[PDB]
Write a structure and sequence with these properties.
The PDB classes it as transcription, transferase/rna/dna. The structure is cut from a larger assembly and holds 13 protein chains of ten kinds. In chain D, helix 2 crosses helix 3 (60-70). Chain D is elongated, with a radius of gyration of 15 Å. Chain D is built from three helices and two strands. Chain D is mostly helical. By secondary structure, chain F is of the alpha+beta class. In chain F, the strands form two sheets. Chain F has a three-stranded antiparallel β-sheet, covered by helices on one side. In chain F, a hairpin with a 5-residue loop joins strand 1 and strand 2 (12-15). The radius of gyration of chain F is 12 Å and the shape is globular. Chain H is α+β, with helices and mostly antiparallel strands. Chain H has two helices and 16 strands. In chain H, strand 3 and strand 4 form a beta hairpin. The chains are: A mainly alpha, B mainly alpha, C alpha+beta, D mainly alpha, F alpha+beta, G mainly alpha, H alpha+beta, I mainly alpha, J mainly alpha, L mainly alpha. Strand 1 (86-87) of chain B pairs parallel with strand 2 of chain D, so a sheet runs across the interface. Bound molecules: zinc ion. Zinc ion (ZN) binds next to loops of chain C. Zinc ion (ZN) binds at residues 15, 17-18, 20, 32, 34-35 of chain C.
Amino acid sequence: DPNLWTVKCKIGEERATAISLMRKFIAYQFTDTPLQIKSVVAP
Amino acid sequence: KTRSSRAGLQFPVGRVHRLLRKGNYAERVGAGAPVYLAAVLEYLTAEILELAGNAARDNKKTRIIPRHLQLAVRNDEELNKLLGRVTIAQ
Amino acid sequence: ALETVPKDLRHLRACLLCSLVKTIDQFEYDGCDNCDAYLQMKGNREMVYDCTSSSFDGIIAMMSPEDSWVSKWQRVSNFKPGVYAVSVTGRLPQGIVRELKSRGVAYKSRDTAIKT
Amino acid sequence: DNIQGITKPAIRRLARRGGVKRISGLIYEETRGVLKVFLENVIRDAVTYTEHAKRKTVTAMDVVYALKRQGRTLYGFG
Amino acid sequence: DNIQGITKPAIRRLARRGGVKRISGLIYEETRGVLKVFLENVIRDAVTYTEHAKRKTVTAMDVVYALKRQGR
Amino acid sequence: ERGFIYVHKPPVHIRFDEISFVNFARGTTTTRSFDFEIETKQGTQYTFSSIEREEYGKLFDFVNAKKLNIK
Amino acid sequence: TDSYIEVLDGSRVHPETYEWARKMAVDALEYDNPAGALEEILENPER
Amino acid sequence: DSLVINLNRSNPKLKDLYIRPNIAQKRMQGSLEAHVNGFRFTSVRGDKVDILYNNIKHALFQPCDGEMIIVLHFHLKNAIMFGKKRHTDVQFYTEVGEITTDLGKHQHMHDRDDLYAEQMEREMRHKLKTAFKNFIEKVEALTKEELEFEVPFRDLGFNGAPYRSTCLLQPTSSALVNATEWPPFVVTLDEVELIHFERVQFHLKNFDMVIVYKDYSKKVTMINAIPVASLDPIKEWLNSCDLKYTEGVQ
Amino acid sequence: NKERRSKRDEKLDKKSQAMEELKAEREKRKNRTAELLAK
Amino acid sequence: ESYAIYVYKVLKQVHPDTGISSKAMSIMNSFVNDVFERIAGEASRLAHYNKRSTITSREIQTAVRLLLPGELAKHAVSEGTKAVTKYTS
Amino acid sequence: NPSEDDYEEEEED
Amino acid sequence: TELLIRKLPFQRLVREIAQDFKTDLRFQSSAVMALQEASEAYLVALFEDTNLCAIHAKRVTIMPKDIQLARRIRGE
Amino acid sequence: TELLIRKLPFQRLVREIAQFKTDLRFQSSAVMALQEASEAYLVALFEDTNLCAIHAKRVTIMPKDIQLARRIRGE
Ligand SMILES: [Zn+2]
């Protein structure tokens, strides 16, 4: 099964980071350097 | 005797059957269907003429006219619902 | 795709069947993507406000349901990639939930959260 | 053209019988256009029926059938 | 009494689907009456067709024939 | 040739370059209910409602020829 | 709401003596309506 | 005559009533009080308007059964001046309606506000009807049948266009009235000379009615656009009212 | 027959009741006016 | 041709002491033809729906009940029933 | 009116 | 009763439209009369509808927009 | 496809008004076709109402708008 990691971030910005990560993935998913991430959690 | 006399009606059962078979509304036509249609036409005509004669006697006349027909049609609620979209000359 | 990613954080709802979190404008224009033929959520805000509900929590960047423990747990492996949630409080009317089972759509409660 | 032959007083009298108390100047041209469209459709249907019957002249029966097709039966000429 | 059961929110949804930008407070009873009249006409036609077909159950085919008769 | 102009009661004029996108919203009916809304790049959205079906089909071809953002 | 309010409620006169008060008002006006006579006496007490 | 100030201590009263025409630029919420010889209307600010009983020519009560306003209409024999203008008709109404873009711009309304809202609306309508009936009965009992209110018969109404506006005229028992639509329409049947139905033919789905008053110096009242289905009913109503009706093709 | 006519029957009944109520109010008004003129 | 003779017979039978006009007779013939056509068209529709190759008394009754209003349709149905009974008798 | 031309009978079978 | 449209202009218009459709055509007197009657009836019905629209619009003067709304709501 | 009226209240109303001939079953498809027809009919009526209101220069439709629409339509 896949592993789960933690990464700090500025206090108060989680949805912004999530949407930014989603945008980066959707942008670089049809290139030679795709993102191997499965998902991210921001409770 | 003629089918009209057989049925006891006054409208022409034979002409009705011929018109039906000529218009080709169906491959065939039963024996009771034409008699029934002639009877319906006769009843409707009898009702219209009754109301027209009533209107004429009210207007004090000896001959039915389009005015009496119109008066009858617009006084009978059912005939109005039946001939709303109908037009008449003069 | 660029049509399922939420555009603006403000004014956002979520579904109860597949738990599809998007923007109100997206729900109004395109509507539910994972369940459209068996919902007719597309083409009006009325069915949107009737079925979906803004009472939901959690955001997960679902990108590989075929291979993901979160999808296997949440039961969203047969859905398209997107941004889903982990809790949605609500319930569909009787008339809206009976047709699902009549046509062949199993209605399950996505509210995995606990109460008290 | 003869479309203008429809006299202004004739259109005014039609509107009066209908129930119009005050008419505008832009009404007469519009009424003429609407009447022209209706007559064109009726004559179209009538000429179709005439070609079907292979007759050389349009008849009151063909006109009545065209009016029926439009949805405005007319008695009297039957 | 099911003419009232027809949820007014339903009428508002039907009306809001196009152009109708604002509605009055009396539109509900008026729309209900119009729906009642239309349903009465369609059901009378369908019941006539069913009695003709002898069946004791109105069918979608009978409804379609009634609608075609009315010219809908 | 290069924009829309609505007349005459409170008239409006919108050039093609000023339009951000367009939307062929479909009202209630399936006939004569095509609202041709126009949103400009400045954020103003003009709603031209009540249009016939054939008029909508022709305007669709026209807008597709002019190449405008159809949402 | 939809009931007549006895005018003597605002006065003393225990409710057990409303009939007596009405009769006294009717007799003072030297009539052959209870409430009307009462309302008239309340404004013309000299009688 | 001057308003005989209420020396009587009771005086029936009703509250919450918008007045037409407007005393000021816009409507004024106020209350009404039945005095010994008239009504006194007092706005929330203090605008006092007097309407003597003797001056009231007709008293109409249009309930909320199928309407957005419950109204009390007074057609006066003479004109009374208020708000720096003289008027012949007065109305005191209370609204029981709602106006929205469609639903409430929200949407979520289940079995805890929608049906509850309907229950509240019904209760308000019932309470207003009860209050108006109570006020009417109190005014009648106080005036000793000197001023009688009239309830219009909605079943005997018909669509008409007196001022060229489709409305539902209602015939009471001594006046053909219509108060919901402003300006009001009032025709006292005691002054009607006769009636004439014009444009009554077969190919005409609408006809006109012409009311001729006894006083020939007045202008005849013409009511246009009336569905032909409502012809025989109007004839029977006029027949009951003892009014002569004739027909005309032009 | 009557089961289907009931609708038009009830309509006619409403109309007749309305006309009768109208006639009753008119008779009341006439009687009251006569009494007032006599007194 | 036309149903003028039959219309005149019905007129003399319902009101033996009255007449009619030329325009009135024409209007009556137009009405007869129109009712015939409407009933025939409805009967053809019903027969095509039932996939039948013969219009029957049942089809005619259904057409009449679909065309004419309630009371008038019931009376016409009764008249047609009596007529077909006398015919088959 | 039903004149003599109108009193004509029908044709044979 | 009487005809509201002028017989000769109406007949000329009928002939003009008939020639526009197909030349070398001929119509019967009864046919022209029936056309005139149908046209008058149609125009009267349209005028009644336009008067209703104007009444609704709170006006007295009938307008081409009213005629257009009448034709639309009718479905022509 | 899309339905705004609740199928259960609609069916209840149909069976309550279908008392012209008591005791008659209505197939599910028949009720569905009736509901679709009713939704389309009310949709067209409201479109005509909006036209009448836009004509009257009022953005809020009122019962007289629907009344005029039905009158001109011939209902
Ligand atoms: Zn979903």
